[PDB]
Ligand binder design. Sequence first.
Ligand SMILES: Cc1cc2nc3c(=O)[nH]c(=O)nc-3n(C[C@H](O)[C@H](O)[C@H](O)COP(=O)(O)OP(=O)(O)OC[C@H]3O[C@@H](n4cnc5c(N)ncnc54)[C@H](O)[C@@H]3O)c2cc1C
Length: 295
Amino acid sequence: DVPVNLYRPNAPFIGKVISNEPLVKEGGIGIVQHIKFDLTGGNLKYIEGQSIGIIPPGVDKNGKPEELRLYSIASTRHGDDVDDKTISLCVRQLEYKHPESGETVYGVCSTYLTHIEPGSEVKITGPVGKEMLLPDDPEANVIMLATGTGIAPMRTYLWRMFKDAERAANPEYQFKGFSWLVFGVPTTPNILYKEELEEIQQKYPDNFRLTYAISREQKNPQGGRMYIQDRVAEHADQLWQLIKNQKTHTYICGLRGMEEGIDAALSAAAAKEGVTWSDYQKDLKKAGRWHVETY
Ligand SMILES: Cc1cc2nc3c(=O)[nH]c(=O)nc-3n(C[C@H](O)[C@H](O)[C@H](O)COP(=O)(O)OP(=O)(O)OC[C@H]3O[C@@H](n4cnc5c(N)ncnc54)[C@H](O)[C@@H]3O)c2cc1C
C-alpha cells in the first residue's frame, strides 16, 4: 500500500516549481519557505509523514556532484490543492558560524531551494519513510511535538484531519479523536502556518489543542527562555494520561536535541504511577506508536 522509492537518485523525477512562498513573517529569525512542485508527467505518489529527496546542482569542494538531501513532505497525499497533482516542502535556509571558515556559511541544498524560482526544474527522489505514518484509525489520539521545520509532517496530518476539502476527499478518514500540537519556535513571526493552525483550533476546539513555546517572548518557571521541553514538563501529567491509551500515537520532529528533556518530563509523570517511562517507551516504539524523526 505504502508508496516507496518510485524514483531513485540514478534516475530522479524532474518536477517543476509552481510556487515558493515565505513562511517567516516580518520580524522573525531566518528564512523558511513553502515550496510546491508539479508532479504531472510522472507517477510519484506519497502519503502523510513521508519524505522526498532533492538533488541540488553543482559540485562540492572536492569536485564531486552534490547528492540528495531529504525533506519532510509538508502536503497531504492530495497536494495543497487537493488535486493529486503536486507536493510541497517546508524548507529553512541553513546558515551559521565562523568556526566553519569564511564568515556566514550557507547550506547548499537549502539555499538552492529557498531561492528557487517558479518554472525551474528540480530533481526529486522518493518517497521514503515508514516510521512517521499516521494510523488509519479515525478515533486515534495524536500527540505532535515539533520545533521549526519539524512542523512539516504535522501539517500533513492536521490538513488530512481537518481541512474541509480533505474531509470531502477522504470518505474513509473522518477524524474524531483528539490531537495536540506543541510547537516551539523563537518568535510569533516564526510560527509557521500560524493562521491556519489557529483556524483549525477555532473550528475544532474539542478535537485539536494548540500550544506554543516561544523562546524570545516567554520564560519558563526557572527564568530561562521557553522551549518545547518546558511546555511538555508543564503538561507532563496530561500528556502521560493520553499516552496511556492503547490508541494514542506520538510524533516528534525537528532538529536533534529535543528528546532528552521530553523523556525526563514524561519519566517523572509515569514514575508517580510506578511506571518506568524508558521501558514503557520501548514497548510503544515496538508497537509502532512512538514516532521520531530528528536531524
Ligand atoms: C528525514 C529528514 C527530514 C528533513 N526534513 C527537513 C524539512 O522539512 N525542512 C528542512 O529545512 N530540513 C529538513 N531536513 C534537513 C535537510 O535535509 C538538510 O540537512 C538541511 O536542509 C541542510 O542542507 P543544506 O544542503 O542546506 O546544507 P549542507 O550544505 O549539507 O550543510 C550541512 C552541514 O553544515 C553543518 N551544520 C548544520 N547546522 C550547523 C550549525 N548551525 N552550526 C554548525 N554547523 C552546522 C554540518 O557539517 C552539516 O553536515 C531533514 C533531514 C532529514 C534527515
